[PDB]
């Protein structure tokens, strides 16, 4: 093995914007990596393809992965409704860090966020599992469609996604 | 992120003295920073403007923020009457440090202090959230109107305050 | 201390259905009873008048009190965005029990539930604070519009509310 890489082709109201790719740190958090990889390829029959980023806060992060209700209340893991925080080995070191959204301890589902800054205050309460490899400039362009309270002003979607290697 | 900057325009017995400005460490304690920022702009309909520094102790600190009772017993946060200790990442490293006053754990309101000395004995029990950028000379002038017990010899007021950046 | 009593006048797609009244156990959880009383009078500028029951599950409970988002994601208390679990003195003893919804420890806001059975699996994790006095029949009627998943076949409304004594 190497650490796996996934891609998101991002669209804005259906117009393609670009690709973001991610290293998933399966050498630190194999279970959390695998969940995201699997949901990215679609191979369990559900996943991120077609889903939207429902909450984007410029200067902070882009939040997505809610493929069942597209508003933050939804999604599911390949392990069931929720799974445990695997460990907190990795920290929120800076822009591009990919980390799990949750609703408290041991509530990992499918939602994730992509950081557009060092978010240190989240260390120890969100499992960090990957980092943006190429396409930070695309995450930066996605930002511009966000707002302070998170509402997006255009529909930002994962038009396709899957694994590169 | 870019850390916000707020300013206070300090008056002594109604006479404008000058400007103090502060960096807020939104990148370490965003919720604490945001409270001070918004109380400083006035944007929720209440806040620091017109309030006084009720307790000044030479060699220690200047304490204010008590915009409802003007004596240490009052104030409220933008989040409700009180909020939790966000974290203790930042320490009380020297003069200029901005930190929350409290009444024990998890009782952050609107009250704060501006250190005029390193105050290491408060680390771990006051959330530090900013630092003087400019106008430390104003804080030193303020400090002279305090006393061992904190009673002030002139009314030290925040005539106006707000966000620069 | 005599315990206060509030009323809900319930409506189904706007068709008046009837009055439910509630004893609030201010003698056990005064802070939690007061939140609900004030929301019920609307005296603080906001409250339950006009809100709906967004999740109703026959044989379990009716959940309402989300007056900002009407889906379980919203509501606020009179003490701010959230407040602490006051105590767990009272248990979920049977139908009619009024208890608080939450998103885990110390996340009480405006959401509540009216039990329709004994729900003892919740003792300790939801602050019980009141109980149906008159109108249990009106709740058993509301119960009929829910479903195993909680979605309601009609808009169950609090057309009016306030305090009797």
């Amino acid at each position: 093995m190497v650490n796996p890489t996934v891609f998101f082709d991002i669209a804005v109201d259906g117009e393609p914007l670009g690709r973001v790719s991610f290293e998933l740190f399966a050498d630190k958090v194999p279970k959390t990596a695998e969940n995201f990889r699997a949901l990215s390829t679609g191979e369990k029959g559900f996943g991120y393809k077609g889903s939207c980023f429902h909450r984007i806060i410029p200067g902070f992060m882009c939040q997505g992965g809610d493929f069942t209700r597209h508003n933050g209340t939804g999604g599911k893991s390949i392990y069931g409704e929720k799974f445990e925080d695997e460990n907190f080995i990795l920290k929120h070191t800076g822009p591009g860090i990919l980390s799990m959204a949750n609703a408290g301890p041991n509530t990992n589902g499918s939602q994730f966020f992509i950081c557009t800054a060092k978010t240190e205050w989240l260390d120890g309460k969100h499992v960090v599992f990957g980092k943006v490899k190429e396409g930070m400039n695309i995450v930066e362009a996605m930002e511009r469609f966000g707002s302070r309270n998170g509402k997006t002003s255009k529909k930002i979607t994962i038009a396709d996604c899957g694994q590169l290697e | 992120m870019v850390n916000p900057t707020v300013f206070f325009d300090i008056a002594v017995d109604g006479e404008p003295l000058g400007r103090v400005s502060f960096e807020l460490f939104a990148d370490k304690v965003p919720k604490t920073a945001e409270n001070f920022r918004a109380l400083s702009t006035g944007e929720k309909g209440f806040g620091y403007k017109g309030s006084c520094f009720h307790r000044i102790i030479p060699g220690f600190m200047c304490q204010g923020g008590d915009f409802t009772r003007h004596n240490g017993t009052g104030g409220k946060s933008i989040y409700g009457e009180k909020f939790e200790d966000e974290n203790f990442i930042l320490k009380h490293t020297g003069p200029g440090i901005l930190s929350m006053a409290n009444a024990g754990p998890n009782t952050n309101g609107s009250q704060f202090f501006i250190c005029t000395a390193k105050t290491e004995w408060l680390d771990g029990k006051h959330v530090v959230f900013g630092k003087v950028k400019e106008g430390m000379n104003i804080v030193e002038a303020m400090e002279r109107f305090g006393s061992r017990n904190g009673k002030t010899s002139k009314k030290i007021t925040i005539a106006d305050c707000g966000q620069l950046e | 201390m005599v315990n206060p009593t509030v009323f809900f006048d319930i409506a189904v797609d706007g068709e008046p259905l009837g009055r439910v009244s509630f004893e609030l156990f201010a003698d056990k959880v005064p802070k939690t009873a007061e939140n609900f009383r004030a929301l019920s009078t609307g005296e603080k500028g906001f409250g339950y008048k006009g809100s709906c029951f967004h999740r109703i599950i026959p044989g379990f409970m009716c959940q309402g009190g989300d007056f900002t988002r009407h889906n379980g994601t919203g509501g606020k208390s009179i003490y701010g965005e959230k407040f602490e679990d006051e105590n767990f003195i009272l248990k979920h003893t049977g139908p009619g029990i009024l208890s608080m919804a939450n998103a885990g420890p110390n996340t009480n806001g405006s959401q509540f539930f009216i039990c329709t059975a004994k729900t003892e699996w919740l003792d300790g994790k939801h602050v019980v604070f009141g109980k149906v006095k008159e109108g249990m029949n009106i709740v058993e009627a509301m119960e009929r519009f829910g479903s195993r998943n909680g979605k309601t076949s009609k808009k169950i409304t609090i057309a009016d509310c306030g305090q009797l004594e």
Binding site: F60, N102, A103 | E34 | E81
Partner: peptide, 11 residues
Amino acid sequence: XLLVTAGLVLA
């Protein structure tokens, strides 16, 4: 504030 939750978004 600036949290990343799923359901109850807090300040």
